Amino acid sequence: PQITLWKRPLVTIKIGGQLKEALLNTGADDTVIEEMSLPGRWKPKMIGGIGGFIKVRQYDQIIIEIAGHKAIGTVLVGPTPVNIIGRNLLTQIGATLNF
Amino acid sequence: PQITLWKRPLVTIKIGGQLKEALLNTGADDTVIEEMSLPGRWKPKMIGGIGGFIKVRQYDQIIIEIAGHKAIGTVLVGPTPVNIIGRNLLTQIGATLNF
Ligand SMILES: [Cl-]
Ligand SMILES: [Cl-]
Ligand SMILES: [Cl-]
Ligand SMILES: [Cl-]
């Protein structure tokens, strides 16, 4: 698809068997999902931006479906106000900015 | 151009006659620039980020060039960690997300 930017670019994702809405975020290095359980090992991490930092759990090798496109990568889980698909997974679905 | 996302989508902007680097950010409603002098009056605005809320200065109708494309619109000024081009100006330059 081609997604215009008049509104927030929200899509449906599937992660850990759950459907969620998430923001396609070219301004995020990483993918950050609101609190949920994921399988396997994790390690703590601090992520930063406007307003400061939050602590998250880093899970590696997690499969997501993003608007029907499957990808795999690291997923961070923590108290983000919005579910975020960041560049580490946007690359895997072939997403580009165009103007 | 068509910009892939393996690295941060940084471009050159021109504002107040000065060249700066800024991040094309589909996860930002608004455009937020680090502390600098801009003409005219400003209004108060609260913005939310990954770490919390911060107060910024809202300057309306500011001339700004983004990757060679001219825009005139609202620029927020405050302690952002990186200069951010948000959707208010991405729409002015004709940017879309594509996959
Ligand atoms: Cl979708
Ligand atoms: Cl925290
Ligand atoms: Cl990854
Ligand atoms: Cl505007």
Side-chain angles (χ1 to χ4, degrees), chain A residues 39-82:
Chain A
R41 301 162 52 187
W42 60 268
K43 57 189 178 186
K45 189 178 175 70
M46 283 281 259
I47 58 176
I50 285 170
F53 292 76
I54 60 169
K55 191 184 173 181
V56 300
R57 303 192 315 277
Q58 175 182 332
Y59 294 84
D60 300 315
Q61 307 185 316
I62 299 295
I63 303 168
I64 300 195
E65 192 178 33
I66 302 159
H69 298 241
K70 280 192 289 168
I72 188 174
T74 295
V75 173
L76 312 181
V77 176
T80 178
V82 174

Short mmCIF file of all heavy atoms in Angstrom, two decimals, chain A residues 39-82:
data_model
loop_
_atom_site.label_atom_id
_atom_site.label_comp_id
_atom_site.label_asym_id
_atom_site.label_seq_id
_atom_site.Cartn_x
_atom_site.Cartn_y
_atom_site.Cartn_z
N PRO A 39 7.18 -15.34 24.68
CA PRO A 39 7.95 -16.53 25.06
C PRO A 39 9.44 -16.28 25.00
O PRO A 39 9.93 -15.44 24.24
CB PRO A 39 7.53 -17.56 24.01
CG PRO A 39 7.19 -16.75 22.81
CD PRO A 39 6.57 -15.48 23.34
N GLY A 40 10.17 -17.04 25.81
CA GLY A 40 11.62 -17.05 25.71
C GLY A 40 12.32 -16.10 26.66
O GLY A 40 11.73 -15.50 27.57
N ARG A 41 13.62 -15.95 26.42
CA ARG A 41 14.47 -15.14 27.27
C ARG A 41 14.30 -13.66 26.95
O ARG A 41 13.93 -13.27 25.84
CB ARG A 41 15.94 -15.52 27.05
CG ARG A 41 16.25 -16.98 27.33
CD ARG A 41 17.57 -17.38 26.68
NE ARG A 41 18.66 -16.47 27.04
CZ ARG A 41 19.87 -16.52 26.50
NH1 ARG A 41 20.17 -17.43 25.58
NH2 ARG A 41 20.80 -15.65 26.88
N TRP A 42 14.59 -12.82 27.95
CA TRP A 42 14.58 -11.38 27.76
C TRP A 42 15.66 -10.76 28.63
O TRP A 42 16.16 -11.39 29.57
CB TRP A 42 13.22 -10.74 28.07
CG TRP A 42 12.76 -10.97 29.48
CD1 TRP A 42 11.97 -11.99 29.92
CD2 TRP A 42 13.04 -10.15 30.62
NE1 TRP A 42 11.75 -11.87 31.27
CE2 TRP A 42 12.39 -10.74 31.73
CE3 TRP A 42 13.76 -8.97 30.82
CZ2 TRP A 42 12.45 -10.20 33.01
CZ3 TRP A 42 13.83 -8.44 32.10
CH2 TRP A 42 13.18 -9.05 33.17
N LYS A 43 16.02 -9.52 28.32
CA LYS A 43 16.95 -8.77 29.15
C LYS A 43 16.48 -7.32 29.23
O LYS A 43 15.79 -6.84 28.33
CB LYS A 43 18.38 -8.83 28.60
CG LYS A 43 18.54 -8.34 27.19
CD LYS A 43 19.93 -8.67 26.69
CE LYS A 43 20.12 -8.23 25.24
NZ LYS A 43 21.43 -8.68 24.70
N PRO A 44 16.82 -6.62 30.31
CA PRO A 44 16.33 -5.25 30.48
C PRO A 44 17.09 -4.26 29.61
O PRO A 44 18.25 -4.47 29.24
CB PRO A 44 16.60 -4.98 31.97
CG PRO A 44 17.77 -5.85 32.29
CD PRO A 44 17.56 -7.10 31.50
N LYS A 45 16.40 -3.17 29.28
CA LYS A 45 16.92 -2.16 28.38
C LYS A 45 16.24 -0.84 28.72
O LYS A 45 15.10 -0.82 29.18
CB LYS A 45 16.59 -2.54 26.93
CG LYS A 45 17.24 -1.71 25.84
CD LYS A 45 16.85 -2.25 24.47
CE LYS A 45 17.38 -1.38 23.36
NZ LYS A 45 18.86 -1.47 23.24
N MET A 46 16.95 0.26 28.50
CA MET A 46 16.38 1.60 28.61
C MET A 46 16.28 2.20 27.22
O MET A 46 17.24 2.13 26.45
CB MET A 46 17.27 2.49 29.48
CG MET A 46 17.14 2.24 30.96
SD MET A 46 15.67 3.01 31.65
CE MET A 46 16.41 4.47 32.39
N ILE A 47 15.13 2.78 26.90
CA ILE A 47 14.95 3.45 25.61
C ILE A 47 14.54 4.90 25.87
O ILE A 47 13.86 5.21 26.85
CB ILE A 47 13.95 2.73 24.68
CG1 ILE A 47 12.60 2.59 25.37
CG2 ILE A 47 14.52 1.38 24.27
CD1 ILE A 47 11.53 1.97 24.49
N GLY A 48 14.93 5.79 24.96
CA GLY A 48 14.79 7.21 25.19
C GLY A 48 14.10 7.94 24.06
O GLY A 48 14.04 7.47 22.92
N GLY A 49 13.62 9.13 24.39
CA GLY A 49 13.02 10.00 23.40
C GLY A 49 12.51 11.26 24.06
O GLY A 49 13.02 11.67 25.11
N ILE A 50 11.49 11.88 23.46
CA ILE A 50 10.87 13.04 24.10
C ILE A 50 10.30 12.63 25.45
O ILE A 50 9.63 11.60 25.58
CB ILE A 50 9.81 13.64 23.16
CG1 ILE A 50 10.51 14.41 22.03
CG2 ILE A 50 8.84 14.54 23.92
CD1 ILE A 50 9.60 14.86 20.91
N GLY A 51 10.58 13.44 26.47
CA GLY A 51 10.10 13.16 27.80
C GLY A 51 11.00 12.27 28.63
O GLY A 51 10.71 12.05 29.82
N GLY A 52 12.08 11.74 28.07
CA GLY A 52 13.00 10.94 28.85
C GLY A 52 13.02 9.48 28.46
O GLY A 52 12.74 9.13 27.31
N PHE A 53 13.34 8.61 29.42
CA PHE A 53 13.55 7.19 29.15
C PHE A 53 12.52 6.34 29.87
O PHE A 53 12.00 6.73 30.92
CB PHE A 53 14.94 6.75 29.63
CG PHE A 53 16.08 7.35 28.85
CD1 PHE A 53 16.47 8.67 29.04
CD2 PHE A 53 16.76 6.59 27.91
CE1 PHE A 53 17.51 9.21 28.31
CE2 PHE A 53 17.80 7.13 27.18
CZ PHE A 53 18.17 8.45 27.38
N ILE A 54 12.26 5.16 29.31
CA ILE A 54 11.50 4.12 29.99
C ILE A 54 12.29 2.82 29.95
O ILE A 54 13.08 2.58 29.03
CB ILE A 54 10.07 3.93 29.43
CG1 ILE A 54 10.10 3.54 27.94
CG2 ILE A 54 9.23 5.17 29.67
CD1 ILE A 54 8.75 3.07 27.41
N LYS A 55 12.04 1.98 30.95
CA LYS A 55 12.64 0.66 31.02
C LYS A 55 11.73 -0.35 30.33
O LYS A 55 10.51 -0.34 30.53
CB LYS A 55 12.83 0.25 32.48
CG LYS A 55 13.67 -1.00 32.66
CD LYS A 55 13.73 -1.40 34.13
CE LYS A 55 14.43 -2.74 34.31
NZ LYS A 55 14.47 -3.14 35.75
N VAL A 56 12.32 -1.22 29.52
CA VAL A 56 11.59 -2.22 28.75
C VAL A 56 12.30 -3.57 28.88
O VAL A 56 13.44 -3.67 29.34
CB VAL A 56 11.46 -1.82 27.27
CG1 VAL A 56 10.71 -0.51 27.14
CG2 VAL A 56 12.83 -1.72 26.63
N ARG A 57 11.60 -4.62 28.46
CA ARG A 57 12.17 -5.95 28.33
C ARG A 57 12.43 -6.23 26.86
O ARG A 57 11.55 -6.04 26.02
CB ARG A 57 11.21 -7.01 28.89
CG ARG A 57 10.84 -6.77 30.34
CD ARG A 57 10.13 -7.95 31.00
NE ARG A 57 9.09 -8.55 30.18
CZ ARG A 57 7.84 -8.11 30.07
NH1 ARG A 57 7.44 -7.03 30.74
NH2 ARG A 57 6.98 -8.76 29.28
N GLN A 58 13.64 -6.68 26.56
CA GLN A 58 14.05 -6.96 25.19
C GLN A 58 13.93 -8.46 24.91
O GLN A 58 14.64 -9.26 25.54
CB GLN A 58 15.49 -6.51 24.97
CG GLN A 58 15.99 -6.87 23.59
CD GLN A 58 17.43 -6.48 23.38
OE1 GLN A 58 17.91 -5.53 23.98
NE2 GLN A 58 18.11 -7.20 22.48
N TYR A 59 13.07 -8.82 23.97
CA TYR A 59 12.91 -10.19 23.49
C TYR A 59 13.45 -10.27 22.07
O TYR A 59 13.07 -9.47 21.22
CB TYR A 59 11.43 -10.57 23.46
CG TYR A 59 10.75 -10.65 24.80
CD1 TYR A 59 10.24 -9.50 25.40
CD2 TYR A 59 10.60 -11.86 25.47
CE1 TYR A 59 9.59 -9.56 26.63
CE2 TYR A 59 9.96 -11.93 26.70
CZ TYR A 59 9.46 -10.78 27.28
OH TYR A 59 8.81 -10.82 28.50
N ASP A 60 14.31 -11.25 21.81
CA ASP A 60 14.87 -11.40 20.47
C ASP A 60 14.15 -12.51 19.71
O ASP A 60 13.52 -13.40 20.28
CB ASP A 60 16.37 -11.69 20.56
CG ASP A 60 17.12 -10.57 21.25
OD1 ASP A 60 16.87 -9.38 20.94
OD2 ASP A 60 17.96 -10.87 22.13
N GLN A 61 14.24 -12.43 18.37
CA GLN A 61 13.71 -13.47 17.48
C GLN A 61 12.21 -13.69 17.70
O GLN A 61 11.75 -14.82 17.90
CB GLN A 61 14.50 -14.77 17.60
CG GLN A 61 16.00 -14.57 17.40
CD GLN A 61 16.76 -15.88 17.39
OE1 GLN A 61 16.53 -16.76 18.21
NE2 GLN A 61 17.68 -16.01 16.44
N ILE A 62 11.45 -12.60 17.66
CA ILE A 62 10.01 -12.63 17.82
C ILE A 62 9.38 -12.40 16.45
O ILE A 62 9.74 -11.45 15.75
CB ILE A 62 9.54 -11.56 18.82
CG1 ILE A 62 10.16 -11.82 20.20
CG2 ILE A 62 8.02 -11.51 18.89
CD1 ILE A 62 9.71 -13.10 20.86
N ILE A 63 8.42 -13.27 16.08
CA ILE A 63 7.70 -13.15 14.82
C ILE A 63 6.51 -12.22 15.01
O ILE A 63 5.82 -12.28 16.04
CB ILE A 63 7.27 -14.53 14.29
CG1 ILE A 63 8.48 -15.44 14.13
CG2 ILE A 63 6.52 -14.42 12.97
CD1 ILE A 63 8.13 -16.90 13.91
N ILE A 64 6.33 -11.28 14.09
CA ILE A 64 5.17 -10.41 14.07
C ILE A 64 4.57 -10.51 12.67
O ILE A 64 5.25 -10.88 11.71
CB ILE A 64 5.50 -8.93 14.44
CG1 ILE A 64 6.09 -8.82 15.85
CG2 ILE A 64 4.26 -8.03 14.38
CD1 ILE A 64 6.10 -7.39 16.40
N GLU A 65 3.28 -10.22 12.58
CA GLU A 65 2.62 -9.94 11.31
C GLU A 65 2.20 -8.47 11.33
O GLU A 65 1.48 -8.04 12.24
CB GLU A 65 1.41 -10.84 11.10
CG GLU A 65 0.86 -10.79 9.69
CD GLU A 65 -0.30 -11.73 9.47
OE1 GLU A 65 -1.08 -11.96 10.42
OE2 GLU A 65 -0.44 -12.24 8.34
N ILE A 66 2.65 -7.71 10.34
CA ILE A 66 2.41 -6.28 10.27
C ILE A 66 1.60 -6.03 9.01
O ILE A 66 2.13 -6.18 7.90
CB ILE A 66 3.72 -5.48 10.22
CG1 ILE A 66 4.57 -5.78 11.45
CG2 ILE A 66 3.43 -3.99 10.05
CD1 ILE A 66 6.05 -5.47 11.26
N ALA A 67 0.34 -5.64 9.16
CA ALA A 67 -0.55 -5.41 8.02
C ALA A 67 -0.48 -6.58 7.03
O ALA A 67 -0.46 -6.39 5.81
CB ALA A 67 -0.25 -4.08 7.34
N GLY A 68 -0.42 -7.79 7.56
CA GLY A 68 -0.41 -8.99 6.74
C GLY A 68 0.96 -9.45 6.27
O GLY A 68 1.04 -10.48 5.59
N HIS A 69 2.03 -8.73 6.61
CA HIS A 69 3.39 -9.09 6.22
C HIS A 69 4.12 -9.65 7.43
O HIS A 69 4.26 -8.96 8.45
CB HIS A 69 4.13 -7.86 5.69
CG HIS A 69 3.53 -7.26 4.47
ND1 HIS A 69 4.21 -7.17 3.27
CD2 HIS A 69 2.32 -6.69 4.25
CE1 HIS A 69 3.43 -6.59 2.37
NE2 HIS A 69 2.28 -6.29 2.94
N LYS A 70 4.63 -10.87 7.30
CA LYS A 70 5.34 -11.50 8.41
C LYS A 70 6.79 -11.04 8.45
O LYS A 70 7.45 -10.91 7.41
CB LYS A 70 5.27 -13.02 8.30
CG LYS A 70 3.96 -13.61 8.80
CD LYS A 70 4.04 -15.13 8.94
CE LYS A 70 4.10 -15.81 7.58
NZ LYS A 70 4.47 -17.25 7.70
N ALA A 71 7.29 -10.81 9.66
CA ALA A 71 8.69 -10.46 9.86
C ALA A 71 9.14 -11.03 11.19
O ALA A 71 8.33 -11.50 11.99
CB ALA A 71 8.89 -8.94 9.81
N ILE A 72 10.45 -10.99 11.42
CA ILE A 72 11.02 -11.45 12.68
C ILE A 72 12.08 -10.45 13.12
O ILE A 72 12.80 -9.88 12.30
CB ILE A 72 11.56 -12.89 12.57
CG1 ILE A 72 11.98 -13.44 13.94
CG2 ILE A 72 12.71 -12.98 11.56
CD1 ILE A 72 12.37 -14.91 13.92
N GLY A 73 12.15 -10.22 14.43
CA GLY A 73 13.22 -9.41 14.96
C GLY A 73 13.06 -9.21 16.45
O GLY A 73 12.26 -9.89 17.11
N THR A 74 13.82 -8.27 16.97
CA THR A 74 13.74 -7.92 18.38
C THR A 74 12.49 -7.09 18.64
O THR A 74 12.15 -6.19 17.86
CB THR A 74 14.99 -7.13 18.77
OG1 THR A 74 16.12 -8.01 18.65
CG2 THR A 74 14.89 -6.59 20.20
N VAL A 75 11.79 -7.41 19.73
CA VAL A 75 10.63 -6.65 20.17
C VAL A 75 10.85 -6.25 21.62
O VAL A 75 11.19 -7.08 22.46
CB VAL A 75 9.33 -7.47 20.02
CG1 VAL A 75 8.13 -6.74 20.63
CG2 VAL A 75 9.07 -7.79 18.55
N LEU A 76 10.68 -4.96 21.90
CA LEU A 76 10.77 -4.42 23.25
C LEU A 76 9.37 -4.29 23.83
O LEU A 76 8.43 -3.91 23.12
CB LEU A 76 11.45 -3.05 23.24
CG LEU A 76 12.75 -2.99 22.43
CD1 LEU A 76 13.32 -1.59 22.52
CD2 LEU A 76 13.76 -4.02 22.90
N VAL A 77 9.22 -4.62 25.11
CA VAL A 77 7.92 -4.62 25.77
C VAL A 77 8.01 -3.75 27.02
O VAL A 77 8.90 -3.94 27.86
CB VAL A 77 7.47 -6.04 26.14
CG1 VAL A 77 6.16 -6.02 26.91
CG2 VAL A 77 7.33 -6.90 24.88
N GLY A 78 7.09 -2.80 27.15
CA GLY A 78 7.10 -1.93 28.30
C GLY A 78 6.01 -0.89 28.22
O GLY A 78 5.13 -0.95 27.36
N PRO A 79 6.06 0.11 29.11
CA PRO A 79 4.95 1.07 29.26
C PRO A 79 4.94 2.18 28.22
O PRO A 79 4.89 3.37 28.55
CB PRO A 79 5.16 1.60 30.69
CG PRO A 79 6.63 1.53 30.89
CD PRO A 79 7.09 0.30 30.14
N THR A 80 4.98 1.80 26.95
CA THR A 80 4.83 2.79 25.90
C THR A 80 3.37 3.23 25.79
O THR A 80 2.46 2.40 25.93
CB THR A 80 5.32 2.23 24.56
OG1 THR A 80 5.11 3.21 23.54
CG2 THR A 80 4.60 0.92 24.18
N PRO A 81 3.11 4.51 25.55
CA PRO A 81 1.71 4.96 25.43
C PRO A 81 1.04 4.52 24.14
O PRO A 81 -0.19 4.57 24.05
CB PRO A 81 1.82 6.49 25.51
CG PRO A 81 3.19 6.80 25.08
CD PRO A 81 4.06 5.63 25.47
N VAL A 82 1.81 4.09 23.15
CA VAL A 82 1.32 3.68 21.84
C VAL A 82 2.18 2.50 21.37
O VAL A 82 3.40 2.54 21.54
CB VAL A 82 1.45 4.86 20.84
CG1 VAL A 82 1.08 4.43 19.43
CG2 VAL A 82 0.60 6.05 21.27
#
